[PDB]
Write a protein that binds this ligand. Sequence first.
Ligand SMILES: CCCC[C@H](O)[C@H](O)CO
Lengths: 295, 108, 120
Amino acid sequence: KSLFQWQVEQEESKLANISQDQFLSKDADGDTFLHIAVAQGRRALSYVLARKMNALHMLDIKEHNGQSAFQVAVAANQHLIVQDLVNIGAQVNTTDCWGRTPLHVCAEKGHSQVLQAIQKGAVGSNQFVDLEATNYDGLTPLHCAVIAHNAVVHELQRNQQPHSPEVQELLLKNKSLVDTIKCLIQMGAAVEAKDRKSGRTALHLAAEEANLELIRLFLELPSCLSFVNAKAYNGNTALHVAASLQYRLTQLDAVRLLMRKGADPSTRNLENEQPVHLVPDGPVGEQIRRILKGK
Amino acid sequence: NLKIVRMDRTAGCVTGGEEIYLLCDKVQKDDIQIRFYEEEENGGVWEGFGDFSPTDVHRQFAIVFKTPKYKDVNITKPASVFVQLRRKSDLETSEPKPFLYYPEIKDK
Amino acid sequence: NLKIVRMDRTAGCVTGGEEIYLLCDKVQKDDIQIRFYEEEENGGVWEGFGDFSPTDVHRQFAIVFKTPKYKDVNITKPASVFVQLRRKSDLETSEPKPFLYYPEIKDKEEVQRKRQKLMP
Ligand SMILES: CCCC[C@H](O)[C@H](O)CO
């Protein structure tokens, strides 16, 4: 007998009482007891309140933010509780009031363990996880994770101090966002999915920031040659974008990496431009031009 | 032909009236429509049109418009529709983009 | 001459990185900047630049770009700045447009608000 089994049977010993009018009732925020317990990390209590709400088919009661208790646990990064909830059938394919799915929230915040919890819980509850769900911004969870990581990387290459409470936070988020992206891909997320606004793939999005870690990660995938030359709505490939960027310290390496992994430098956009036609003026663009031409 | 190159919004509330910036291949300001539509197995589609004046067509390459009201403002689940450019004179259309109408929050 | 005809956002988070569609009179994609700026009491000027590549310039008449980070992401009240087009070659500027930077809304999911609540 593990400890959690004790506190669970122990919990139900303390609240075989409450009952049925008090935990189904909603706060001014719309919060039930489960919402609060979940947010506080009370795993044992959450398990019990969930089982009692579930039997009444009231598990996915949403607060004023359109969040079920499961959605709250996602945001709260309570991956243990998350798995417990999804396991007993908490709806994974749902949105909050901002149009975000639980996967989107995971993606934005880099909650990879929560993501793994959802994967396990959905298997043990026969639920289909929609990895290609789009939010109100037309983005898949993979898209959001990439954009979130771009922001972190862009800042890491900008703040001048290691000891800062923010940088060490940025460093850990740099790691967690990549782990989240790896999980999404392992779960079967389509790297070639296109942002509805502009037709950008996850590769396009990475290229916008010359995000070397993500560009490398994506180009190592088995389907690499199938999306490396994908075009956004304006006809641009990731190579077009990389070759044209405002100067970043990783721009040249991004162009080299794309070339080395099979990107086609002769591809033309809607205005019949090849990446070489988009290079900045001056020495830097000349260096990029050689990379595009060279072997 | 006609082409939508970019849209700053691909979702909107069913109540309509929400502003969207659309970037397009060259159009003429008096010959262009923005058509929202949804094909059920039915025989005659639902359609709505973007609301804008010719002055909202920016230098023939962009259009600022407001979304039409969706057919059912009382839905509880988001409805997937399509949006396309259409030329008034010959009724030619752009390839359709997905557009998501989401439910209204009717409280306070 | 340079002119911002209209922008789909007149406000954004201090954190920056938010996408804005700007419609402009004719520009050349490699010769255009979007400058956010704010005069300061000591006579200095804060400036931040919209983030975009030339391919984000749509047929010389629109620019899609990401907002810069504001100078202070820790403000508690919104800060007003100006935004202008600027040509890189001769540093000519458009007339300015108003822009409002607002504080980052931490914990919009209200996670911490629930942790402070009490139960039986
Ligand atoms: C909050 C300070 C306002 C700054 C202002 O928009 C510019 O300096 C105008 O000169």
